[PDB]
Amino acid sequence: NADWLTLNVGGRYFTTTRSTLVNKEPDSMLAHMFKNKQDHRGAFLIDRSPEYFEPILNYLRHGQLIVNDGINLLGVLEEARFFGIDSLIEHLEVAIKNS
Amino acid sequence: ADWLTLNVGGRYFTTTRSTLVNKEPDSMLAHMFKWGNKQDHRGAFLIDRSPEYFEPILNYLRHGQLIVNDGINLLGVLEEARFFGIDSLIEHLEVAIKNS
Amino acid sequence: DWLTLNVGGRYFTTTRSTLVNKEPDSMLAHMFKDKQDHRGAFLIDRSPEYFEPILNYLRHGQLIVNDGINLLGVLEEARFFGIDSLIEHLEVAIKNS
Amino acid sequence: NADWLTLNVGGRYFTTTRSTLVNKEPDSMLAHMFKDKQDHRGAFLIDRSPEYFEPILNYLRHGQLIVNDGINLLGVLEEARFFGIDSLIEHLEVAIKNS
Amino acid sequence: NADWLTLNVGGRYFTTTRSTLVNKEPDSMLAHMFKDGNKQDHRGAFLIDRSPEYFEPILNYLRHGQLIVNDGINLLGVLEEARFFGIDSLIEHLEVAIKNS
């Protein structure tokens, strides 16, 4: 809420808050990352896909899985696994059971 | 007349204060003209939301109409509409999702 | 003569000639005959996503868009900026979609 | 020749080589442009659409027409005519004959 | 893991690690970053004259060894880049992917 952070994911810059990253849930890699490496703009470097990082950060923001038509849910699942957000993994699995 | 830049999720939007304050003024968005969110390096006011689902919001602020392209999940628009507190667009969106 | 436009946050670049020749009767051409930001770009409080087909139509006089984009979005910028011919093209385009 | 060139197309920056812009289309406007109008970043200014310019540049790169679903081929055809690359014009016309 | 690199592909900047570029395909031309590539822009990114739009799935496959793209994406554009950079496994994967839509 008060502490602003910038994340360099794969070359794309996201801006968020520490509170968003460490809360809901605190038991993910992401949360333990921000409590390393610095790029040329101060942002913290992450070697993943930013295209499939959007729904991850959004789910961190409001706890809901929202995505546009045609977007492969497998990538989102992969990134969710990497960062270790369990709830989103479950939601994604019950989402891929019936597509 | 008075131009503002917003940093939403890492994406920069340029508009005017008039667009944000007017139509409608009983949202937190309009209330953000009085808040310690101003400082990034380009002077843009920081907002921790999805920029992808923010463009229809700003456009609705610009011309009072809901326009999005095919395949766009307007649930994500509804969530932003709730967060920023634009009630008219919330209604618009609900009657929009009633039959899709 | 080169100009840069800041539309809704997105920077487009085009000659003044394209903005003024064809569509000499509405606000776009009338703006550029002679308010700016740091990069010297002319500020426009509209949607850039629906602004690209407008500028394309200014460039070669044709309405070309990919599958899925809402023609209403293009029509709203077309009304705002005031390109009559493109408004006609768009209306006859929405007649049968 | 074989210098790294930057093109400012419609406000979007593309990076390539002179070789790519000259060879496999020596009889086009593009090739005729780069043998010897710059913005501040030194990029050469082109007043066209970048969204329909990427497939053009790609065709320059590997001589093939590749485009995602839903992309209007007409927009590519117009740029194809403007830059005067006849082979790609032919490809495009036989591509629009059956869509 | 520790060594960060920026690639300028066709004008678009990707950021990754040398580890990702040289492991899980050390015999592809990309592994020419197994040494340090003496062509750099002003920012310092290594220049590559290809399409960035079809470079995303390549780099992602380098990252987690899986072919993941959204609906409507022309797989041919990915195949061309895979051929250029010389990732054979991805070429096989793509070939068995295209012969049945």
UniProtKB/Swiss-Prot annotation, chain C:
Residues 1-67 form the BTB domain. Signal peptide: none annotated. It comes from Homo sapiens (Human). Forms pentamers. Component of a complex composed of 5 subunits of KCTD9 and 5 CUL3. This is BTB/POZ domain-containing protein KCTD9. Substrate-specific adapter of a BCR (BTB-CUL3-RBX1) E3 ubiquitin-protein ligase complex, which mediates the ubiquitination of target proteins, leading to their degradation by the proteasome.
